[PDB]
């Protein structure tokens, strides 16, 4: 079974293939799952030639298989060759999601109710990820998948990491081609040990974009990103500067002309005043001063949805960095083989 000149060998369970996307990690087809009677998405990965591909693939498999939550894409099945030497490829089967928040935003300005409900779902999903001691690190509209009934599922954990308080403190973002518009200002500054708070910054950028239908900090590079950010937030206070450990980062911000804060109601004059108050708490320059995921769910903007008893946490959190950086690509080949064993 050959699609665009590539093998795509998904056994008798998955048939009726159509190609629907491809790139640096994954030829994707849709297919009919003949067990569940529904069309699914099948990502074909072959990563064994480059240590970076293996780290990323092992993480993602590990994390998605541990997670089970309605607002997070699952892995429904995995297909791979029956012996390690045979495995050139891994096929990951997931729910087929008709669209994503990126495409939606370009087709329409969302009503306040839709914004609220999408922000609810994003944070409910995030609550569970952070409760698992994981940082997503690449939240953005295209990683927010949507079905035809407004159900949202955050997927793409290729750049996710366990939060390890000490020790090998993360840890670069090595998928260099995709947007940086959602990245916290401490990542742009190359900070040391960033925290869950980077994902709350990305969510604040997504909120802002849902409110006005355009990206809030669309920088062309790291320095233009900072400028966008500082142009709206104003110059950081000395207190916030003093918190910056990296000296040449702090020295660089100290070099710049003073910028005043632009009130959120001037940028967003028709947005709900509570969404703006929440937005303000997410998009705080200082990572320590940013609202946390539970306090965001309990913010008045989300009062109509907030239901702690229906907002689950992870039963088994990840404890420590998976010790992957030093490990060679043949070794990573072994654990990927083992992680995938539950499916045959």
């Amino acid at each position: 079974e050959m699609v665009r000149g590539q093998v795509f060998d998904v056994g008798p369970r998955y048939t009726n293939l159509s190609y629907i996307g491809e790139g640096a990690y994954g030829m994707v087809c849709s297919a009919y799952d003949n067990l569940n009677k529904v069309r699914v998405a099948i990502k074909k990965i072959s990563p064994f030639e480059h240590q970076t591909y293996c780290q990323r693939t092992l993480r993602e498999i590990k994390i998605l298989l541990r997670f089970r939550h309605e607002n997070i894409i699952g892995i429904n099945d995995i297909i791979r060759a029956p012996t390690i030497e045979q495995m050139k490829d891994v096929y990951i089967v997931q729910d087929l999601m008709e669209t994503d928040l990126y495409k939606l935003l370009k087709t329409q300005h969302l009503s306040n109710d839709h914004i609220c409900y999408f922000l609810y779902q994003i944070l409910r999903g995030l609550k569970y990820i952070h409760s698992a001691n994981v940082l997503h690190r690449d939240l953005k509209p295209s990683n927010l998948l949507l079905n035809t009934t407004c159900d949202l599922k955050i997927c793409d954990f290729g750049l996710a990491r366990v939060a390890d308080p000490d020790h090998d403190h993360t840890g670069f973002l090595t998928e260099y081609v995709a947007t940086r518009w959602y990245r916290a200002p401490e990542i742009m500054l190359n900070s040391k040990g960033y925290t869950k708070s980077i994902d709350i910054w990305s969510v604040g950028c997504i909120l802002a974009e849902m409110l006005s239908n355009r990206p809030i900090f669309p920088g062309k590079h790291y320095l233009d990103q900072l400028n966008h950010i500082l142009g709206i937030l104003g110059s950081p206070s000395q207190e916030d500067l003093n918190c910056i450990i990296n000296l040449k980062a702090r020295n660089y911000l100290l070099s710049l002309p003073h910028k005043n804060k632009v009130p959120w109601n001037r940028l967003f004059p028709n947005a709900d005043s509570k969404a703006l108050d929440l937005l303000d708490k997410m998009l705080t320059f200082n990572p320590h001063k940013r609202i946390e995921v539970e306090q965001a769910l309990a913010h008045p903007y989300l009062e109509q949805y907030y239901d702690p008893s229906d907002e689950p946490i992870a039963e088994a959190p990840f404890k420590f960095d998976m010790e992957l950086d030093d490990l060679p690509k043949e070794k990573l080949k072994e654990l990927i083989f083992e992680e995938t064993a539950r499916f045959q």
Binding site: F172, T174, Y176, V177, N190, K220, H221, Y222, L223, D224, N227, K248, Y252
Partner: protein, 154 residues
Amino acid sequence: DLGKKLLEAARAGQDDEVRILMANGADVNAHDDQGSTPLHLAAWIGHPEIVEVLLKHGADVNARDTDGWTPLHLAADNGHLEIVEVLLKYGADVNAQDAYGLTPLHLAADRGHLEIVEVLLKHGADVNAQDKFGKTAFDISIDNGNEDLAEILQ
């Protein structure tokens, strides 16, 4: 104003519309409010043949948008290998600085576009150029954790 229709045509990626508009006299050096010319737009989206016909018809290879970006910055940032070559052939300034002092080399390095870095370097790119923060391409290879980049950079 054909100028205004050519920009869109170029931003769209339509080879025929571009030609027809140009045959009718469209200004190849028209610009939008943000200073993008049809050459910037074609170089950003990645339309090699359009980049060629504009250059062929007098497009300013080194036009700067309001952020100081040239067509070569765009091509370098977006991974458009053939387009970089074409621009260089037509006199693109390999060491063009944007407002923040970033050159096409900083951009290709930061995006990890290794083939583009090599082409820029072969055309006299300045590996020691510093942006307004102080960073060279090298510091970018260290900051991004790109060991393959740091491999070609010495």
